[PDB]
Amino acid sequence: TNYKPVANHQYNIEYERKKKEDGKRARADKQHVLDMLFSAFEKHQYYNLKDLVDITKQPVVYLKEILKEIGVQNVKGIHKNTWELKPE
Amino acid sequence: GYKFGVLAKIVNYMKTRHQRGDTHPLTLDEILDETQHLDIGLKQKQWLMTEALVNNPKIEVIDGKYAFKPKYNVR
Amino acid sequence: SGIVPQLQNIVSTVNLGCKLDLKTIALRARNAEYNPKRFAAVIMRIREPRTTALIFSSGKMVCTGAKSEEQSRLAARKYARVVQKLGFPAKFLDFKIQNMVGSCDVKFPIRLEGLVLTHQQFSSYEPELFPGLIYRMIKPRIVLLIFVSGKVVLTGAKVRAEIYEAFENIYPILKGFRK
Amino acid sequence: LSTMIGKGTGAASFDEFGNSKYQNRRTMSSSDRAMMNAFKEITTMADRINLPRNIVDRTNNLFKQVYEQKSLKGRANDAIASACLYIACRQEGVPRTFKEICAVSRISKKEIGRCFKLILKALETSVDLITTGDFMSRFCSNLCLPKQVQMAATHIARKAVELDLVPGRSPISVAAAAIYMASQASAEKRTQKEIGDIAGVADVTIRQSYRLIYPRAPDLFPTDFKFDTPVDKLPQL
Amino acid sequence: LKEVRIYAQKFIDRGKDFNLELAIKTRIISDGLKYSLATGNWGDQKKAHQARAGVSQVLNRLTFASTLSHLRRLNSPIGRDGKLAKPRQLHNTLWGMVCPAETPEGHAVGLVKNLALM
Amino acid sequence: EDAPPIDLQAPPRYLLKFEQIYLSKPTHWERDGAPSPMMPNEARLRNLTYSAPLYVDITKTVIKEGEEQLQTQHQKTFIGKIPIMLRSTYCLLNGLTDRDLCELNECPLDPGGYFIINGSEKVLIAQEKMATNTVYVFAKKDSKYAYTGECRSCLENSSRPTSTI
Amino acid sequence: MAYQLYRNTTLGNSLQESLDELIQSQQITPQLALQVLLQFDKAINAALAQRVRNRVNFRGSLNTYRFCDNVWTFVLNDVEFREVTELIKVDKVKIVACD
Amino acid sequence: LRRNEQNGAAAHVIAEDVKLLQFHVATMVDNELPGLPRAMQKSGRPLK
């Protein structure tokens, strides 16, 4: 009764269904992302790119492009270089 | 949150306004009007007027008002 | 042979030569549906041609569902006019037919087991994955789905000549494995 | 080829604060490291379904060619390993079903089947078509059917295919129906759910294939078969 | 269980459930038990430096008595290379427990022993 | 049983507990996948390892923070193969009359007590060691200590290896 | 700043019209009227979800459809709203959906 | 080590490399160094 033949694993169809139901992140307009981007900066002075993506819910490439124009990367030797939401 | 994000929109709107060729200085209240920041808090207003708009290297204090700094930038 | 495949679907891509605003098109277009989370194009359907077309922000459009070359071009032009009627400078540039799908029946059962043995270099029969034999013709680059019931589906043709030429080549082969 | 530094023994081997100053360094190539992990995955899958080491060795060779050929570089290594394991079983004359390979692999059946087609194209090789008799020994042994019932099922499926009573049916579906027919005609009777679970075939599919061969049941059975249940009284469904 | 935790950690981290069967590596117990008996190196193959050797030996089939003797053999902790008379001596306490006569001649005198009959 | 339950947390929380152990007869799998009982003589001739499949019952409980607990048990999960000592309670030859052993090409006088690993009959030699948990006082003539009382303390059921004081 | 669906309905239209009358009389500032509409949308949305437990069925023909920002704008012709208690006929209906 | 010098890597990175080079060179001649790790053959057997 072990390793019974199966077309797809139950854990895999659920994850596939969840990904399909959620759908891919859409590329929103720059103005809305900027407004949401700066509102996030208010809560925390420093933000990680991986965590920042979740707040913005935007594609990584699109978020980086908009963040690159205004945001800058500050190198921290303690952990790693992260992004700065302050334009200056 | 609050007290740290409205400034970025002011800077970006200021940068975009300069790109249009408007070198004239703009008041804090005037810039707030076009950035949808009419509800900006009072203690935020003073902080911008005292620290943000002077410490930044892209803000020029001219006749009291604030204007871009294209002179420092190479044009 | 006496049997001519009948086209079931044609895929044609045409460039409108102008960037388009997908959100604006969806709001104003009659049948357009835009779901950026799902797909990055605008899906529109017109009933009289009975075809579906996808519109991208780059201005390139893909038309599918046409049953003939004339229908595909006519359907594609109609879609371009709809976008043009929305205020965009849509044009009809480098219209091309990308794929032609044809289906037919040989009117006799086929022994797919024998066919794959004699044509293992071109055939691929996997009952677990698909109940129909997949034949990849080389001289015309046409992929044929041969079934035990005799139904044959041709796809990947750029012109109607390939569809007929491909069937003419495979029909004698199928006749040799008649069941 | 390389040597690993052993564990420290004296105080000179350890840094000023505990940790050893001479520590092993990862000097393995990325290509070799990935290939090493795939072989580990290939052996893990094989042990799950008790495949002999010769099939694993054939799978490892298949993966190396595909990995070096680099036509499947876009696909996950586990899917390539799973597809190579499937191909190795076919090449050795003991095919496993795509579902059986998927059970021992995190990769789904669809992705194994897709990599399987690409690997054949990349290797310019082919696999002989599976027959109903390629699964009888494993399916019947797993169902705990006697040799006589296994022989009856093997004959029924082979005769049914020859008589073309199940055209276009998957060989696994035919075999499961034949096992059900043979099982119901002997003392050891197995339900459709039981046979489907081992065969990886939905009981509906067994019912459909069985219904096609049921009309000619007496012809399919071996002549020297002792019917615990007479062929006339076999289930009609 | 270490690899079951490691495997399940990767899937749970990604937010998807994990298949329990795919988490289990059956080679760990099958090969680990087989290797120790196959080679006699007692412990882990990677840690063979500290692994006790000679625990597993090919059964002697020269004679039936030799076969029986090999199944009742006792190995002393003292290393064969090391030399020390006291562990090799026939201690009083071996009466009725260990054969006072059966012992190999050479480096293993007194170190390899055989159970008394009862 | 003594193994701690595996707790996963990274939010949903997964618990795994290994309940009960099952052992089947020494089985051999043909290349086609059909299992069959492995006779010791076949293991010797074909260089097989005389091993019994090992199965464990595993209970998987998941807590999703929604105040709902889902518990599923994976009965008899294969976790590996244990080599079997011949003529032991779990060997195929166990409980076979001398006549039955001859039918299997096995010598009735053969005492068992050994393993067949890759067809090689392997015997584990009894390893002699100092008793644990007992206080022993010894005198070292050369060492800096006049006397030394040691105790090799080990957990019940022989858990993490002996600790000496 | 909410879903804002039922504003363009008989219930929504009446509420909007009433606020206009007060505004013309200077009784309520324009900001207050927006807040009242916002609160109404929250109440109606919750009201429909909880206190409505009746199922309906309908059939017809679709003439046009649209989709944007998770908003459908179906246009059905000759719809037949069929219910266990009663049947309702209509020449044309527009179904607007959101999520 | 040569690449690190050419690439101008950090001093501590080079120092760790020099430590390994000293160990490998030393255990190429004598692999029974007292109070030092042994060079194994990827299988637990010390190198000769």
Add this chain to the structure above:
Amino acid sequence: TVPKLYRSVIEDVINDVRDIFLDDGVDEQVLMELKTLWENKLMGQVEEEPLNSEDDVSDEEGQELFDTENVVVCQYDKIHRSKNKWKFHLKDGIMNLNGRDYIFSKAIGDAEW
């Protein structure tokens, strides 16, 4: 039945706005006046660039412009379509059919295109 549901909505609406009316400092008398008015109101072309060769390839655009016909506003759980037909798993919502207001919780709809 529907009027009774409308009355319950009024109670929720007035209650939900009491806190807001206190936040802005407006007198509570405004709410009482609002309800009174609200109740009363209810009761061979080788050169293909020119597309002008085809005309009248559209329909009247005033269907959505008018919107005077019955309009249904609701929420969708699932919306599936298979090459001819549109299926609608519309959840709780509202309908405006011939002026009369209809309320539903589960709605199933099949349409042909």
